Amino acid sequence: KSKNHTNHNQNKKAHRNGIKRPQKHRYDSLKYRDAKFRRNQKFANRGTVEAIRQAKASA
Amino acid sequence: VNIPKTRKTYCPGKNCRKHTVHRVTQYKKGPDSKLAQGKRRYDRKQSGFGGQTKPVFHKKAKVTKKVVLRLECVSCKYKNQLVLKRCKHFELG
Amino acid sequence: PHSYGIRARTRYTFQRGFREHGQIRLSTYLKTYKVGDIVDIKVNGAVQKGMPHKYYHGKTGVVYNVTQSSVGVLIYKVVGNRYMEKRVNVRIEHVKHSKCRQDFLDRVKANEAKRKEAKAQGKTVQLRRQPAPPATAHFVSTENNEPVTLHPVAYDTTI
Amino acid sequence: KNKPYPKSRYNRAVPDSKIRIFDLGRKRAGVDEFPLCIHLVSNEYEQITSEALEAARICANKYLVKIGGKDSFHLRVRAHPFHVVRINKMKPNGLVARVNIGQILMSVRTKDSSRATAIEALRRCQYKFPGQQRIIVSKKWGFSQYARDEYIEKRSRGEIIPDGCYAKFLNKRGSLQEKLDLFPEASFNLA
RNA sequence: UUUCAAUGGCCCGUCUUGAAACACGGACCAAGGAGUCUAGCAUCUAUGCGAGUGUUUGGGUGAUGAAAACCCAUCCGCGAAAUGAAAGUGAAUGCAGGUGGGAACGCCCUUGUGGCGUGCACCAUCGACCGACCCGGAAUGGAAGGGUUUGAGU
RNA sequence: GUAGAGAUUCUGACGUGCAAAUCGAUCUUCAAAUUUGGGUAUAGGGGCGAAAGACUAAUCGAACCAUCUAGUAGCUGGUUCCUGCCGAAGUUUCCCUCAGGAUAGCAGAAACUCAGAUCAGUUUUAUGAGGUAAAGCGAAUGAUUAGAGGUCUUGGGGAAGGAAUUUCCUCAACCUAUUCUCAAACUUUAAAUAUGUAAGACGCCCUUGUCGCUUAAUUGGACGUGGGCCAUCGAAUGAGAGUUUCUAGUGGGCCAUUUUUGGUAAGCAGAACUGGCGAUGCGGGAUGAACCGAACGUGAGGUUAAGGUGCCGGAAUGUACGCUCA
RNA sequence: UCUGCCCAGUGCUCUGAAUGUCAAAGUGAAGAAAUUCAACCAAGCGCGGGUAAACGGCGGGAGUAACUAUGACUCUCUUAAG
RNA sequence: CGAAACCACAGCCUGGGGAACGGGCCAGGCAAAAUCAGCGGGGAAAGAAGACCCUGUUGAGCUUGACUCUAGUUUGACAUU
RNA sequence: UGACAUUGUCAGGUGGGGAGUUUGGCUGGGGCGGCACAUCUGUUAAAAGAUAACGCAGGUGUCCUAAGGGGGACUCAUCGAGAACAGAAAUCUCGAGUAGAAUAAAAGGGUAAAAGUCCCCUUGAUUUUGAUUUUCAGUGUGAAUACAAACCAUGAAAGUGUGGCCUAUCGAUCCUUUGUUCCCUCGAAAUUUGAGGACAGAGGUGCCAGAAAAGUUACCACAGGGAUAACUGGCUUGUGGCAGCCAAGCGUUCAUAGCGACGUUGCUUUUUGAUUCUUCGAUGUCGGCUCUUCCUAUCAUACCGAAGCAGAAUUCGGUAAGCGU
RNA sequence: GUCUACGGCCAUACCUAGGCGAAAACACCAGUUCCCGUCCGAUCACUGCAGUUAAGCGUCUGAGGGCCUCGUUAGUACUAUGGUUGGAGACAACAUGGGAAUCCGGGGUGCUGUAGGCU
Ligand SMILES: [Zn+2]
């Protein structure tokens, strides 16, 4: 007879290789953020880079 | 369902990119032009011996269909299409 | 006999508390949330909009995005042999801060204060917690507290 | 081992219980009369049917009436059959009572002279019930919860006013006027 | 090696949750007997060359003896540019960019699970450039300005 | 009724026979719609048929021969040397899918990145969430048996002088305070078990820079920069970890404990957790796939588990106190 | 010795009297043309007549008894003919 | 003079367990060469890849107002004219 | 006879006479029934999540230009006391009234200066892009959430609006059709028809990740299946029969001479049924005949007990399967 | 300390009955020309301060109904783990741990933030 669903071995199979955790990354893509926030952070990060470059060049 | 003969809604036309007055009509299928490439290929396939060459719909069900409203701009002549839910009777005005 | 509706089997999960219906307290809207904050998800039955799924009810996560009236609680959910990142947009009515984080912040502040104080005093600081130690040796006295002998009670009818 | 299956709007075809009356004797009794109580209680979890309850009720009523008269017993059947045990029709079939250990099945209150009569009556009534049952001489005054010594001390003080079979008992809660007017002999101690 | 005694030992293969099965095949022995070749594709490995790579479609030493080995020219195949249905257009603001981790190396502190400086590979991320799309857009052209986007790109 | 032509019964003989249809007795017909020789004609979706799908060379509900053809088969059978290192699944989704495939999972091989930052089928601390066990019905809802009082207002009958918009007590009804018993699709409460998160260096405090976002506003958000705290780097325990590429088999499961549903029940069917058999030998239960103990290279010595010590059978016809005659 | 009733249905037959409809081909108009739009046409067919020693019918059905079903019962329609 | 069917190996029973009726396994009853003629209780005896049923995206004979066609037949147009 | 017919080509009708092919799936065998085939609510679901059955109680393929959106005002269902008329609390007042009403359609949850009722204005039921949740393989479809870029509605405004308070109400390839633009192509160069493309939708696929599809075989065939029925064993007893317990009783009069209700504890089952563990490369299948053996739940024969003149007859009663039937 | 305005927790704050409230504030209250809306200045509006603490409001008092908190109930019910434990079974006991509800009794009957007025 069909429809033989069971969950006896599924937990054991999952724990055989364990429950893997996602790789941790310092930076996450800004596509998940607000559009206005991402657009402004682009200019804010850009200006920060020029300021650092100017400071290093002057030093 | 009852839909008014006229409604004010956004017009995607280039000359009028704002909310304008649109006249509402129900969309209907065209007259099924014979010069279409698919029709010509079907006729060429059907010619000669071999009988029916493509599936022909026999079962008929689900008389209710999605309602399509044609919105026509007053001055810009722009036409826009909207999709409604499935209803048995459609009445304008 | 099984349905997969969004709010299936949420009869008691999404119920308001007894004598807790009606107006929603307005301090929830005045609470401020920031990216990186650890918050708990508790679905409010009165606010139908912005409702998270029943799985995330009672879970805890980290906010990555903040909008006008919602947050970006990030959860890890088991789908088999791995965790997946779930990004739920939840209105602040279903979101409250985790008191553990406030306790952890106070503990960190106390630890740093003790560290500076011990550095000034030139002694040990003992900033690391420990489990419950075994009981030490005491000298329990009996004056005015003479022991009382107990005996098992005989069985008797109590009806 | 089945889940409880009471008569609800989902299944309204539950047949009527065979046993209709539950109390036999002086239902309009008094506080002074019937000072002793005898209980027949099952010693395990059974599924006594309403048909068995009917037979035990008939046997107990007839025996008590013929051997002690109308005015020497107030037997009542505590068991109320609500669970349904299904039987295939040749689907609810009948009503049974779910009783655990220590749950009173039959409770009779008589006088001190009728202790042996009540013991004999509830001993003969055991054959009409599935499983094992025990008979205990209750230490409480009638069907009330208070024990013998507590009840007599309460009666001596004057804190009990009979009202039909049961009675009203004084409590240190409520307005003083509504209790002082009702109780003339209540000695409110000023402490 | 044969035999005796003690103890243990069910008939192999197969389908099957389960075979000693009253499930199937098998009386015995010898010989034969079943994942091979080809046109492709994908991963990995080895070899040669390397922004190139592939002599054998073909021609010559070649008659002696030459189905081999060796030599030789122009096409062409793949790669060096992508994107769009197409008309078409077609990849450097910079050290061919910034950030974090990061091999190896160098310099110190003193023994450290130590600091400083660059930083190969790889991953994550913020940008820049090319094509397409959506824009404003100051006869034909889309030069500058853009974008919540899109490509198997630089 | 003989010859000839047939084949009713014995359901006889035989039934690896004399015989791939015969033998014996019996029986039908026997001068015509009779039997039969030779010649000739009709050929396979055709012939022929007093019609049985009958006959058509022992082959007929479509003859035989050769080729297409080594036709296809989700089905059955088989599939050939050794030893080492590993080692499953009968589960998710989709498919005119249910004896089959694709997909994910379980596995092997090839590796690569790195090795002190981080992990964990675990506990502790701190902080969330649940509505099952239990409990309650004089608390909401439903179900449930019977008493006491109010209810001079028809919610039922006559009577008091036919007589009453004046009354009685059985009739029902409402309310009040005790009182009997329940709820998987009731609940104020509410466990145990299970479950989410965190346990500082990518850390804590001040200086300062960017922005086209935001604020009345350098206001704030985010990203940063430079300096102080690097000696319990902030619970216990343990342990090297992670990421790729390709591919095999599997996609019928079953048993036991506990929690259950459907069933009168079932060595029944269907769900949840764990341990097993499948793929697990060994000691024990006289025997046994799952039960108890225990997981296995080849041996020596010692000691045990579960289980036993009258004989079979290795081990006390041991010790102490009682019960039992079947 | 009889072969009774039914042409409602499906068959068969007779109608060309509908022109209700139509293919190919031909005709008229528009267009620059492919082409489009209009009328035109035989047969078939829709009706009409006949036919049962043609197929067949001589009662169809609906809600329903202590598993269920039921057809006890509750009732209608007979329809071509009973 | 002289076969054949059949043949995993073989052949005494009871009970137990077991793929739920064993010749083999466990516990018992027991057990003595080599043979002849019968016999039909067993070997779930032999034959024959169940002919009953189910599955197969396997067929065939037959039927019809199944789908797609077709010989024939009827009518019309064009040519012969 | 005669430019008719015949013949040749094309076209319409008819054509099981003949050919080819189909005639779904799940299923306690199959068929029938039903859709558990695409779905939602409560429960089974054993307090994270997940969790099956042809388990239970029920709903769904619609409906709404308002029953969507905004704003303002009011508070409901019931109860008591009054106003007429005659029951009609129709209707009109004053108080009580935590929602016992309503919220389109099933259920659950939510809602009281509202999410309910009334009034005013409107079409955010609009265009576009990315992100996210559920079913999930983290594919598709469907449904949903929070934002961003425009145009708007409403309100004084803060704000609220990308359909229905939330949980159901739906659709790929190919083809056709519609909308769209100073869009591209018809490849020798142009113009106009026509055709083909890019982007956004709809047509129907309910077997709902989507074939175009009637039966029979009592002449039958093949590959298999004990994954699957009849049959065969084995297990179970819904039913029936049988054996004890309690004693209200009947038995002129005595509760068990003997019957003996209602219940209760068991045994058997030769009644089919339940499941599908063995058997489909094969266990010959009812009855009758013949023959042997075994059990007692004893018809007779042997010996006993119970009541009453005896003699019969009853409990066949107690042992008893030796011997007959 | 009292009052007003805006609130936070949202009944130790609600409902009921009875005693008190100096000043200020609040409220009750006096009118309809204007803005505004009703059958009705009842409500919503505007313009006011003659009159009143009587209603609202605040506070205190109930062996008050509820609500909050703590103990009894009770380590009782229940439950994780274990046995070649008992019992035919239902169930029960024990061992290593966790641990209620309800009833009853005792106590209580709002606290608090900002800005301003008050013999
Ligand atoms: Zn317009």
From Swiss-Prot, chain A:
**Compartmental location:** Cytoplasm; Nucleus, Nucleolus
A Gene Ontology cellular component where this protein is annotated is: cytosol
Pfam families for the chain: Ribosomal_L29e
InterPro entries tied to this protein: Ribosomal_eL29 (IPR002673)
A Gene Ontology biological process in which this protein takes part is: cytoplasmic translation
Question: What Gene Ontology terms describe what this protein does at the molecular function level?
Answer: structural constituent of ribosome
Key words, A-Z: Cytoplasm, Nucleus, Ribonucleoprotein, Ribosomal protein
Q: What ranges does the record give for the region Disordered, renumbered to this chain?
A: 1-30
Q: Where is the composition biased (Basic residues)?
A: 1-24
Instruction: State the family named in the UniProt similarity comment for this chain.
Output: Belongs to the eukaryotic ribosomal protein eL29 family.
Tell me, what does this protein do in biology? Component of the ribosome, a large ribonucleoprotein complex responsible for the synthesis of proteins in the cell. The small ribosomal subunit (SSU) binds messenger RNAs (mRNAs) and translates the encoded message by selecting cognate aminoacyl-transfer RNA (tRNA) molecules. The large subunit (LSU) contains the ribosomal catalytic site termed the peptidyl transferase center (PTC), which catalyzes the formation of peptide bonds, thereby polymerizing the amino acids delivered by tRNAs into a polypeptide chain.
Oligomeric state and interaction partners are given as: Component of the large ribosomal subunit (LSU). Mature yeast ribosomes consist of a small (40S) and a large (60S) subunit. The 40S small subunit contains 1 molecule of ribosomal RNA (18S rRNA) and at least 33 different proteins. The large 60S subunit contains 3 rRNA molecules (25S, 5.8S and 5S rRNA) and at least 46 different proteins.
Query: What is the recorded name of this protein?
Result: Large ribosomal subunit protein eL29
The organism encoding this protein is: Schizosaccharomyces pombe (strain 972 / ATCC 24843)
Curated annotation (Swiss-Prot), chain B:
N6-methyllysine-modified residues are where? Answer: 54
What GO molecular function annotations does the UniProt record carry, in alphabetical order? structural constituent of ribosome
User: Which Gene Ontology biological process is one annotated for this entry?
Assistant: cytoplasmic translation
**Under what name is this protein listed?**
Large ribosomal subunit protein eL42
Q: Which UniProt keywords apply?
A: Cytoplasm, Methylation, Ribonucleoprotein, Ribosomal protein
Q: Which family does it belong to?
A: Belongs to the eukaryotic ribosomal protein eL42 family.
Main localization (coarse): cytoplasm
This protein's assembly is summarised as: Component of the large ribosomal subunit (LSU). Mature yeast ribosomes consist of a small (40S) and a large (60S) subunit. The 40S small subunit contains 1 molecule of ribosomal RNA (18S rRNA) and at least 33 different proteins. The large 60S subunit contains 3 rRNA molecules (25S, 5.8S and 5S rRNA) and at least 46 different proteins.
| UniProt-annotated location(s) | Cytoplasm
Swiss-Prot record, chain C:
> Subcellular location, in the record's words?
Cytoplasm
A single GO molecular function term of this UniProt record: structural constituent of ribosome
Query: Could you name the domain of life of the organism this protein comes from?
Result: Eukaryota
Matching entries from Pfam families are given as: Ribosomal_L21e
Q: Which InterPro entries match?
A: Ribosomal_eL21 (IPR001147), Ribosomal_eL21_CS (IPR018259), Ribosomal_eL21_sf (IPR036948), Translation_prot_SH3-like_sf (IPR008991)
Q: Where is this region: Disordered?
A: 113-139
Q: Please verify whether the record's keywords include Ribosomal protein.
A: yes
Q: Name one GO cellular component term.
A: cytosolic large ribosomal subunit
Keywords attached to this Swiss-Prot or TrEMBL record, sorted alphabetically, are: Cytoplasm, Ribonucleoprotein, Ribosomal protein
List GO BP terms, alphabetically.
Answer: cytoplasmic translation
Subcellular location, principal: cytoplasm
The record's section on SUPFAM superfamilies has: Translation proteins SH3-like domain
| Record's subunit section | Component of the large ribosomal subunit (LSU). Mature yeast ribosomes consist of a small (40S) and a large (60S) subunit. The 40S small subunit contains 1 molecule of ribosomal RNA (18S rRNA) and at least 33 different proteins. The large 60S subunit contains 3 rRNA molecules (25S, 5.8S and 5S rRNA) and at least 46 different proteins.
Q: What else is known?
A: There are 2 genes for eL21 in S.pombe.
PANTHER family per the record?
A: 60S RIBOSOMAL PROTEIN L21
Q: Which family does it belong to?
A: Belongs to the eukaryotic ribosomal protein eL21 family.
The name this protein carries in UniProt is Large ribosomal subunit protein eL21B
What's the source species' lineage?
Answer: Eukaryota, Fungi, Dikarya, Ascomycota, Taphrinomycotina
Name the encoding gene, please. Answer: rpl2102
UniProtKB/Swiss-Prot annotation, chain D:
List the GO terms this entry assigns under cellular component, sorted alphabetically: cytosol; cytosolic large ribosomal subunit
Q: Any transmembrane segments, and where?
A: none
Q: Which residues form the signal peptide?
A: none
GO MF terms held by the record: structural constituent of ribosome
One GO BP annotation of this record: translation
| PROSITE patterns referenced in this protein's UniProt entry, alphabetically | RIBOSOMAL_L10E
Q: Name one Pfam family in it.
A: Ribosomal_L16
Q: From what superkingdom does this record's organism come?
A: Eukaryota
> What keywords appear on the UniProt entry?
Cytoplasm, Ribonucleoprotein, Ribosomal protein
**Main location per the UniProt record:** cytoplasm
InterPro entries, per the entry: Ribosomal_uL16, Ribosomal_uL16_CS_euk_arc, Ribosomal_uL16_dom, Ribosomal_uL16_euk_arch, Ribosomal_uL16_sf
Protein's UniProt keywords contain Ribosomal protein:
yes
Q: Where can this protein be found?
A: Cytoplasm
**Anything else the record notes?**
There are 2 genes for uL16 in S.pombe.
Q: Which family does it belong to?
A: Belongs to the universal ribosomal protein uL16 family.
Please give the NCBIfam families that the UniProt record associates with this protein.
PRK04199.1-4 (NF003239), uL16_euk_arch (TIGR00279)
Function (record text): Component of the ribosome, a large ribonucleoprotein complex responsible for the synthesis of proteins in the cell. The small ribosomal subunit (SSU) binds messenger RNAs (mRNAs) and translates the encoded message by selecting cognate aminoacyl-transfer RNA (tRNA) molecules. The large subunit (LSU) contains the ribosomal catalytic site termed the peptidyl transferase center (PTC), which catalyzes the formation of peptide bonds, thereby polymerizing the amino acids delivered by tRNAs into a polypeptide chain.
The name this protein carries in UniProt is Large ribosomal subunit protein uL16A
The scientific name of the source species is Schizosaccharomyces pombe (strain 972 / ATCC 24843)
